[PDB]
Amino acid sequence: HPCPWEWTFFQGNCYFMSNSQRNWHDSITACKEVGAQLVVIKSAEEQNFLQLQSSRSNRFTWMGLSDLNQEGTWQWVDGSPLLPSFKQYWNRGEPNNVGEEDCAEFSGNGWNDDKCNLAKFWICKKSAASC
Numbered sequence: 799h800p801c802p803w804e805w806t807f808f809q810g811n812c813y814f815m816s817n818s819q820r821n822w823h824d825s826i827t828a829c830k831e832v833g834a835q836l837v838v839i840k841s842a843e844e845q846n847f848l849q850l851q852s853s854r855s856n857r858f859t860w861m862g863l864s865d866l867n868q869e870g871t872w873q874w875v876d877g878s879p880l881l882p883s884f885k886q887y888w889n890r891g892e893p894n895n896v897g898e899e900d901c902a903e904f905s906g907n908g909w910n911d912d913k914c915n916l917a918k919f920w921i922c923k924k925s926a927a928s929c
């Protein structure tokens with residue numbers, strides 16, 4: 799189950815770290831085009847792994863998490879709620895909704911809420927067995 803050219807493997811999934819930039823909704827579409835999903839994080843170690851990729855590349859990167867539907871209620875693009883323990887991953891002072899910020903990104907060593915219509919890099923996730 800190797801990952802394809804210029805994907806990244808971790809714990810049985812393949813991740814695509816984009817080299818172009820898209821707004822949040824277009825990032826969701828780009829992942830669906832390749833049979834993947836704008837990344838939904840399911841564990842601490844997956845968070846630590848993805849956060850470090852984004853931190854060391856100095857790339858502000860979308861993940862599949864928003865509070866577009868109900869301000870302050872964050873939910874992943876697969877419909878799962880943000881668990882309270884995962885709220886540890888917000889950067890200090892986030893989420894702050896400054897000017898209305900409804901989409902989550904990796905920013906430095908944790909997460910930031912930012913404007914969904916900003917173009918950022920993105921990460922898709924797909925099982926390695928499905929390639």
Ligand SMILES: COC(=O)[C@H]1C[C@H](OCCN)[C@@H](O[C@H]2O[C@H](CO)[C@@H](O)[C@H](O)[C@@H]2O)C[C@@H]1C(=O)OC
Pocket residue numbers: 892894896897899910911912913
């Ligand atoms: C509409 O929001 C703004 O005018 C500002 C708010 C923040 O200014 C504080 C000085 N850094 C900036 O917002 C960025 O950084 C924040 C963390 O410091 C973060 O929570 C925000 O999501 C955003 O990434 C700058 C911002 C602005 O309009 O200028 C870029």
Ligand SMILES: [Ca+2]
Pocket residue numbers: 865866869898899900
């Ligand atoms: Ca809002």
Ligand SMILES: [Ca+2]
Pocket residue numbers: 865866869870895898899900901911
């Ligand atoms: Ca918000």
Ligand SMILES: [Ca+2]
Pocket residue numbers: 892893894895896899910911912
């Ligand atoms: Ca913010």
Ligand SMILES: [Cl-]
Pocket residue numbers: 815816817818
């Ligand atoms: Cl790309």
Ligand SMILES: [Cl-]
Pocket residue numbers: 818819820
């Ligand atoms: Cl593109």
Ligand SMILES: [Cl-]
Pocket residue numbers: 826830835836875876
């Ligand atoms: Cl999706």
